[PDB]
Write a protein that binds this ligand. Sequence first.
Ligand SMILES: Cc1cn([C@H]2C=C[C@@H](COP(=O)(O)O)O2)c(=O)[nH]c1=O
Ligand SMILES: Cc1cn([C@H]2C=C[C@@H](COP(=O)(O)O)O2)c(=O)[nH]c1=O
Ligand SMILES: [Mg+2]
Ligand SMILES: [Mg+2]
Ligand SMILES: [Mg+2]
Ligand SMILES: [Mg+2]
Lengths: 194, 194
Amino acid sequence: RALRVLVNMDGVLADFEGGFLRKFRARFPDQPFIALEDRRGFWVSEQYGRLRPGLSEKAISIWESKNFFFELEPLPGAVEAVKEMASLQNTDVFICTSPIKMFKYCPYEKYAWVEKYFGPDFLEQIVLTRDKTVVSADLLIDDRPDITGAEPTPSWEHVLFTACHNQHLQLQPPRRRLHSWADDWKAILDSKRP
Amino acid sequence: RALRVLVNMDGVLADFEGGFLRKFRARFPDQPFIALEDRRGFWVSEQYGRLRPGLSEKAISIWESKNFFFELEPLPGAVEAVKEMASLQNTDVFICTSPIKMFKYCPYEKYAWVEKYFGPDFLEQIVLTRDKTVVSADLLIDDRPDITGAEPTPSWEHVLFTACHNQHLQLQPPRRRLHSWADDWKAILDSKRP
Ligand SMILES: Cc1cn([C@H]2C=C[C@@H](COP(=O)(O)O)O2)c(=O)[nH]c1=O
Ligand SMILES: Cc1cn([C@H]2C=C[C@@H](COP(=O)(O)O)O2)c(=O)[nH]c1=O
Ligand SMILES: [Mg+2]
Ligand SMILES: [Mg+2]
Ligand SMILES: [Mg+2]
Ligand SMILES: [Mg+2]
């Protein structure tokens, strides 16, 4: 009855790519790096690892470090759009995010980030999971192309949120994109309503 | 195709009631307390609050304190049963747990607890959410009687795990219980398979 929308955090709400590149360059100023226009594929670690031996591990250490997640900047229009989306009649919004393997900071910082931008009351809307296919909803807005897990037939339609790593990707019909938060997300939502 | 089972953490895997009572008594030795046989209703804070003014807040401070979640003891048979359950053919097990409002320690400690008892590889099977009805599965084993949220018709059957606070409760047919991990959980699982 209410339309349910899952909104991914990294690469959709939070600027993981920009914050990573900045911190990587400051920490490792003598290593080569991947400019955002050159990013391809979801896994930053795999691309950096192909660039040079040992770079995978150095990339991983950036997001394993304290304050990495907390200090991510919101992507343009993300906060405003999700706030309006959640205020819409017959619309329930959840933030669906995958923590990393190292769990000392990431869970905590992700809660703190959501509190900071959306307020205490929005914390109730967070789902942390490595498997999104077991979360049921009408829509999932997420920048990762390949979303898989234990449920072979997820209830949501995956709308690919555009990011540097996926912008060149040709999708198979009928898969569809949300180009940025300036794009017409209301029309995508409305297309799933009765 | 695989049977999917969500197993709650507090009151099912982890002995929240016992660990709370112990820590409450050590910290507040001059307050009255609720013996486990006298516990009624899911909310410890509400019962303690009816016992005396100010006790709700003192109860809350126990589980808000560092190491509360981490130092919970496993309930008898819980670790062994979940390990066997996850090893079964055509069976995917997730640990589904609701964090508290105060998020500095609880998320982190819950990951650490699961690592401690089930190993690093089991961390992938954790879903943190305040709303279990948006997690899809065949079964949810959970000690809280009233499980509600945004999805009015959850895909799972809720099997009530017995606890001090619910043991006297008469359920409405066809709702059903798992009495403890010594009870025949395999038969409940098998009843949901093709
Ligand atoms: C790009 C990248 C990300 N991650 C972790 C860090 C944050 C989450 C982002 O996953 P998401 O919830 O946005 O699907 O995965 C990785 O573990 N490796 C990587 O290469
Ligand atoms: C008993 C009790 C528990 N909680 C929090 C602490 C741990 C989780 C347990 O929720 P569960 O995932 O077991 O449904 O809720 C509370 O916030 N208040 C209470 O009175
Ligand atoms: Mg993402
Ligand atoms: Mg709404
Ligand atoms: Mg419980
Ligand atoms: Mg199995």
